[PDB]
Structures are given as C-alpha cells and as structure tokens.
Amino acid sequence: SLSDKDKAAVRALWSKIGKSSDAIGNDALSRMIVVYPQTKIYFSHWPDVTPGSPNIKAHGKKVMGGIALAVSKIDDLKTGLMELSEQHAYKLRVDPSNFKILNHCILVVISTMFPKEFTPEAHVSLDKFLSGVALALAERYR
Amino acid sequence: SLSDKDKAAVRALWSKIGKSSDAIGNDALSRMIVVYPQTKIYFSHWPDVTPGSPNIKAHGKKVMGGIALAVSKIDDLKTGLMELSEQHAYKLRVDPSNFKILNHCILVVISTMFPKEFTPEAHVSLDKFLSGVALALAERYR
Amino acid sequence: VEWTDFERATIKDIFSKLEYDVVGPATLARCLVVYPWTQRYFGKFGNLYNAAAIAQNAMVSKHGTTILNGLDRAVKNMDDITNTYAELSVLHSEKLHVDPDNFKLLADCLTIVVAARFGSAFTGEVQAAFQKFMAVVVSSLGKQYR
Amino acid sequence: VEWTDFERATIKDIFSKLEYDVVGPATLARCLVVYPWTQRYFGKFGNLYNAAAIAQNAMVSKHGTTILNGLDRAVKNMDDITNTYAELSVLHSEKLHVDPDNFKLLADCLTIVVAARFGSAFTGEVQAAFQKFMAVVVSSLGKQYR
Numbered sequence: 104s105l106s107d108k109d110k111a112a113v114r115a116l117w118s119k120i121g122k123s124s125d126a127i128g129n130d131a132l133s134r135m136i137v138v139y140p141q142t143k144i145y146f147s148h149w150p151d152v153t154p155g156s157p158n159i160k161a162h163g164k165k166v167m168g169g170i171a172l173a174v175s176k177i178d179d180l181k182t183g184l185m186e187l188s189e190q191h192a193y194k195l196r197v198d199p200s201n202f203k204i205l206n207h208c209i210l211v212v213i214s215t216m217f218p219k220e221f222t223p224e225a226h227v228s229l230d231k232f233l234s235g236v237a238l239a240l241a242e243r244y245r
Numbered sequence: 246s247l248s249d250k251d252k253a254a255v256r257a258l259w260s261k262i263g264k265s266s267d268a269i270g271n272d273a274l275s276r277m278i279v280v281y282p283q284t285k286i287y288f289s290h291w292p293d294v295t296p297g298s299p300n301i302k303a304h305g306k307k308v309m310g311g312i313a314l315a316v317s318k319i320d321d322l323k324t325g326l327m328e329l330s331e332q333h334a335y336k337l338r339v340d341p342s343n344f345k346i347l348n349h350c351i352l353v354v355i356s357t358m359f360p361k362e363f364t365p366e367a368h369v370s371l372d373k374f375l376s377g378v379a380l381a382l383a384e385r386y387r
Numbered sequence: 388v389e390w391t392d393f394e395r396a397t398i399k400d401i402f403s404k405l406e407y408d409v410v411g412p413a414t415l416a417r418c419l420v421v422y423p424w425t426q427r428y429f430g431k432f433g434n435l436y437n438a439a440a441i442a443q444n445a446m447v448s449k450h451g452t453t454i455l456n457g458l459d460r461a462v463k464n465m466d467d468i469t470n471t472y473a474e475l476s477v478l479h480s481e482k483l484h485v486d487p488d489n490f491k492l493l494a495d496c497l498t499i500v501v502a503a504r505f506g507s508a509f510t511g512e513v514q515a516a517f518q519k520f521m522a523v524v525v526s527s528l529g530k531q532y533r
Numbered sequence: 534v535e536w537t538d539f540e541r542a543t544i545k546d547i548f549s550k551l552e553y554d555v556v557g558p559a560t561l562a563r564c565l566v567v568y569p570w571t572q573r574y575f576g577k578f579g580n581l582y583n584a585a586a587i588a589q590n591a592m593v594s595k596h597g598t599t600i601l602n603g604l605d606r607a608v609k610n611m612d613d614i615t616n617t618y619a620e621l622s623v624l625h626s627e628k629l630h631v632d633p634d635n636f637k638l639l640a641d642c643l644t645i646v647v648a649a650r651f652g653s654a655f656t657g658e659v660q661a662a663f664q665k666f667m668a669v670v671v672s673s674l675g676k677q678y679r
C-alpha cells in the first residue's frame with residue numbers, strides 16, 4: 104500500500120513531469136512494442152503497429168491520461184480506476200503481465216527524460232504506485 | 246481484492262482441508278526447495294535443507310499457521326498479517342519473488358491431496374487469496 | 388537444456404498415462420476460469436460466462452484435446468523442441484495473435500491438473516521434470532514472436 | 534543466444550562509456566533503496582537505514598564498482614557468458630547465499646541508471662540489446678544454484 108511518503112513523492116514527481124505526459128506515453132509504448140514484441144497482439148486491429156506512429160501517440164495519451172487520473176485518485180486506486188478496469192477486463196482482456204512490462208517501460212522513459220528528478224526515492228515510490236495501478240486495473244479480471 | 250464469493254470459497258476450502266495443514270506445509274516447502282533450489286539460501290543457517298526433514302516439517306507448520314491466520318483475517322489481510330510482514334521485511338528480508346513460488350507449490354500440493362475439492366472455482370479464489378497474502382506480507386518491505 | 392534419463396522417463400510416463408480427451412478439456416477449462424483473460428481468443432466458442440458453462444462447452448473441450456495432442460511432438464523428441472514448434476509459434480503469433488504469456492498460464496493449469504491426476508506420485512522431483520519440460524515448450528512457442 | 538552485430542556493438546559502446554566508479558555505486562545504491570530486501574547481505578556495511586545514508590556509504594560504492602567491473606568479462610566474450618560466470622555463480626550460491634532473483638533486480642536498476650546516463654540515445658532498440666545482454670548475465674549467475 105502507498106504511505107503518505109509514497110503519495111507525496113508521486114504527486115511531487117508528477118508535478119514536475121506532468122507537462123511531458125504526451126511524450127512520455129509515446130516513448131513508453133514505442134519502447135514496449137520494440138523491446139517486448141509480444142505486446143503487439145493487442146493492437147493487431149490497428150492498420151499497423153510501429154514506434155511513434157499516430158496510433159501509438161494517441162494510445163500514449165490514453166495511458167498517460169489513465170496515469171494522471173491515478174495520481175489524482177491515488178488515495179483509492181481501486182475505486183478511482185473502476186471504469187478502466189472494466190474496460191481492460193471484459194472488452195480488451197489484457198493479460199496483467201503486460202501491465203508490469205509497460206510499467207517498466209514508463210520508469211525507463213522517465214529516467215531518460217528526467218534523470219535529476221528520478222531519484223532512488225522517487226523511483227521506489229513510483230514503482231509501488233505503478234504496481235498499485237496495475238493491481239487496480241486487474242480488479243475486475245477474475 | 247477478494248469478493249464475498251472468493252472469501253466463501255476460501256473459507257469453505259479451508260474448512261475441508263485445514264485438518265491436513267501440517268502435511269500440506271511439509272509437502273509445499275519440500276517441493277519448493279527441490280523444484281526451486283535457489284530458495285534454500287534463506288535456510289543457509291541449518292546444517293542442510295532437505296525435503297521432509299524435521300526442520301522443513303517444523304517450518305511447514307509455521308507457514309501453514311500463517312495461512313490459517315490469513316483465512317481468519319481474510320477481510321483485512323494487511324492488518325491481519327502485520328507482524329508477519331514486519332518479520333519478513335526487516336528480519337528475514339525474503340524477496341517477494343519467493344512468495345509467488347511458494348504459493349504455486351501450495352496450489353500443487355492441495356491439488357494432489359484434494360483433487361475433488363480443488364475445483365477451478367476453488368482454484369481461482371485461492372489463487373487470488375494467496376496473492377493477497379503475498380502482498381500483505383510485502384506491506385512493510387519498502 | 389541437458390535432459391537426464393529420469394526427466395526423459397518421467398515425461399514419457401506422465402503423458403502415456405494421461406487421457407487426452409479428459410485432461411485436455413479440464414486443463415483449458417481450468418485456465419479459462421482461473422485466468423479469464425484467456426477467453427479473448429474464444430469468442431466463437433460459445434457460452435463462457437461461468438465455470439459451469441465452460442465445463443459444458445464442447446468447443447472448449449475439443450480445443451483442450453488439440454492442445455494436449457500438440458505436446459506429443461515435444462515428448463517424442465525432447466532435444467528439438469524449439470524447431471519442432473517454430474511453425475506453431477508463427478501461427479499463434481501472426482495468425483491467432485495469442486499473447487504468449489498465456490502459454491505459461493496454461494502450463495501452470497496443466498501442472499495442477501496433472502498433480503490432481505497422479506496425487507502422491509507427483510513428487511517434487513516429478514514436478515521439477517514436468518515443469519522443466521513445460522518451460523521449454525512455452526519458450527519454444529514464444530520464440531517466433533516479432 | 535545468437536547475437537546480432539548491432540547488439541554486440543551497442544553493448545561495447547555502452548560499457549566503454551560508463552564511468553564504473555560512478556555508475557556502479559549509483560546502481561547498487563538505487564537497488565538497496567528500491568528493493569530494500571537486498572540489504573540482507575550487507576550488514577557489515579553499516580548504516581543503510583535510508584536513501585541518504587546509502588548514498589553516502591563508501592562500502593556500498595566500493596561494492597557497486599566491483600559489480601560493474603564484474604560485467605567486463607561478459608562484454609569481452611558474449612558467446613561464453615555461462616562458463617565465464619560459473620565460478621561466480623557457485624560463489625554467490627554457496628558462499629554468499631544470495632537469492633538469485635536479486636540479480637534481476639540489480640539488472641533492472643542498472644538499466645534505469647544507464648537510461649539516465651544516455652537519455653535520448655537509449656532508444657528502444659538499445660534497451661532491447663542491453664536487457665538481452667543483462668538477461669543472459671543474470672541467467673548465468675543463477676545457473677549454478679543447486
């Protein structure tokens with residue numbers, strides 16, 4: 104669970120990096136499909152699945168929009184991400200293993216873009232936060 | 246999170262198999278150290294780590310006692326397993342990866358011993374439960 | 388992977404004793420219940436709204452048998468599992484678009500089903516060999532994903 | 534593993550540009566903070582009670598440098614990583630009693646540190662090659678656990 108320390112750390116980090124959410128999302132998903140090509144099966148319905156493509160950029164905004172929502176609803180992720188959970192559970196059926204993959208990619212992107220802001224303290228809290236997000240998204244799964 | 250359905254399934258299953266907790270613990274830990282020999286490092290303080298040994302049997306009772314506690318405190322695992330979390334977090338420092346390993350071994354043992362009772366429904370609920378237990382034990386980790 | 392004679396014997400023993408049209412269906416049905424997201428690829432298989440429905444689903448059962456039979460080629464030549472499943476890997480990836488993580492989950496369900504089937508005979512040593520074998524199969528099935 | 538020329542080149546490039554007495558300490562310190570259970574083996578290092586103390590700890594820095602230096606042998610011969618780390622694997626298992634999952638965690642922290650070091654140049658392609666290399670090292674280090 105997230106402590107008051109974790110919550111302040113995530114809110115503070117987001118305060119600094121939030122302005123670059125679009126870029127973060129684009130970069131994160133682009134890494135995901137390149138480094139973990141198996142994740143592409145979920146986008147088989149797109150005209151193509153390529154790094155930095157219009158589809159990836161749009162999807163980047165969607166995911167980071169979800170993360171922004173999670174930061175605002177950080178006190179209760181399960182309730183806060185209810186709609187997203189239902190979506191991913193019944194319509195998309197995204198194996199939770201992919202949430203871990205994407206979370207790792209998001210951490211990598213933030214480190215490349217904000218090396219000074221992404222301290223070990225910020226890292227541990229954000230990691231705990233993203234795990235909480237992944238679990239909240241899995242709420243309606245089984 | 247555990248639903249009313251999950252809680253009932255786990256309480257019902259434990260009602261049936263609880264009588265065999267000692268044997269379940271011995272078998273589970275014995276499988277863990279054999280199939281995943283890397284887990285033996287946590288017992289490096291013993292002369293050796295062998296299946297069905299007096300030490301493994303004793304430890305099996307400890308773990309299954311923790312599970313019995315989890316079943317009773319199923320409505321709030323975080324609070325229910327506080328002491329155990331503190332223990333595993335600061336004194337033992339058991340990497341959470343091992344909880345996933347042991348949980349798999351527990352499911353395997355229960356399936357060998359209680360094939361009729363361990364239906365897919367009992368399986369999904371106990372799996373969610375054990376994941377909840379692993380997360381509750383990880384509470385005081387970082 | 389360097390197989391020991393015990394591992395080779397154990398795998399042959401297990402598979403020769405499994406009734407595919409019973410174990411296959413049970414395995415897939417269990418996977419669809421324990422890991423519901425696996426239902427993603429079975430939209431044309433019919434009713435899967437609950438455990439009982441999945442258990443009564445003839446299409447699910449038929450496919451479970453297909454999957455189990457699909458392991459025979461690996462059992463027959465444990466030293467060439469990668470090449471043996473190359474075609475099947477490309478199929479699951481580019482034709483069926485199946486998330487390969489589901490392979491690991493299915494393997495885990497098979498281990499649970501096999502465990503229930505053999506009881507006390509499914510020792511830690513037998514479990515180790517079985518999981519080692521399944522891990523190689525799972526790895527092979529995911530190799531052609533690009 | 535079949536290494537491509539790009540992967541070989543990328544690994545050499547990254548490691549040749551890394552300042553070991555900076556990256557090493559940063560990596561271990563980050564791992565000790567993000568995955569606190571790794572502190573289990575460093576009781577003789579003294580104060581590891583918080584991020585600040587860990588960053589100021591000379592023994593942590595020294596060991597981080599040792600770990601990074603330990604990767605050079607893998608970089609030099611990418612086709613023999615298993616044999617090259619066999620003795621080190623036995624050491625970590627039987628003498629140090631280190632949980633091998635910690636190797637994966639350390640590798641993840643290294644990837645994070647390297648990403649911060651190279652920024653935009655650490656593309657998905659570079660990340661893929663770096664992680665592939667680290668995965669082989671991690672596998673090799675835990676190979677001799679029995």
Ligand code: HEM
Binds near residue numbers: 170
């Ligand atoms: C940090 C975790 C994630 C968040 C917060 C998130 C958030 C979202 C949101 C907000 C939507 C849009 C819903 C709508 O507008 O109707 C969406 C859709 C979707 N997400 Fe997720 N998602 C996450 C991870 C993933 C992962 C790891 C995958 C799979 C590799 C995935 C696959 C999809 C797909 C397939 C869609 C549908 C988009 C389309 O059809 O083009 N998501 N996501």
Ligand code: HEM
Binds near residue numbers: 304
């Ligand atoms: C289902 C999860 C688990 C539960 C509920 C559990 C429960 C317990 C309990 C109740 C104790 C005794 C605490 C005391 O004496 O105050 C204990 C001790 C311990 N546990 Fe855990 N445990 C679990 C998993 C693990 C795992 C996976 C490992 C490592 C592979 C582990 C290693 C230890 C060790 C080293 C001790 C002390 C043994 C000794 O020094 O002889 N436990 N556990």
Ligand code: HEM
Binds near residue numbers: 425450457475485490
């Ligand atoms: C032990 C792992 C598995 C093996 C060995 C395996 C084997 C097979 C085989 C032999 C086929 C028939 C291929 C052909 O000749 O056309 C097949 C088809 C298929 N498999 Fe897999 N499979 C495995 C796991 C999975 C998993 C986990 C899923 C997804 C949850 C999956 C989904 C499918 C689907 C959708 C088809 C096509 C069914 C149809 O439309 O008739 N498979 N599999």
Ligand code: HEM
Binds near residue numbers: 571635
């Ligand atoms: C990238 C992975 C790693 C590499 C290449 C590596 C390399 C090394 C090397 C070269 C040594 C010195 C061995 C000697 O005495 O000759 C060593 C020692 C040691 N390693 Fe590892 N190691 C790795 C990861 C880890 C991790 C993650 C931990 C635990 C969290 C760990 C704990 C230790 C300890 C306790 C020592 C002994 C230090 C001392 O004597 O003060 N290592 N390692």
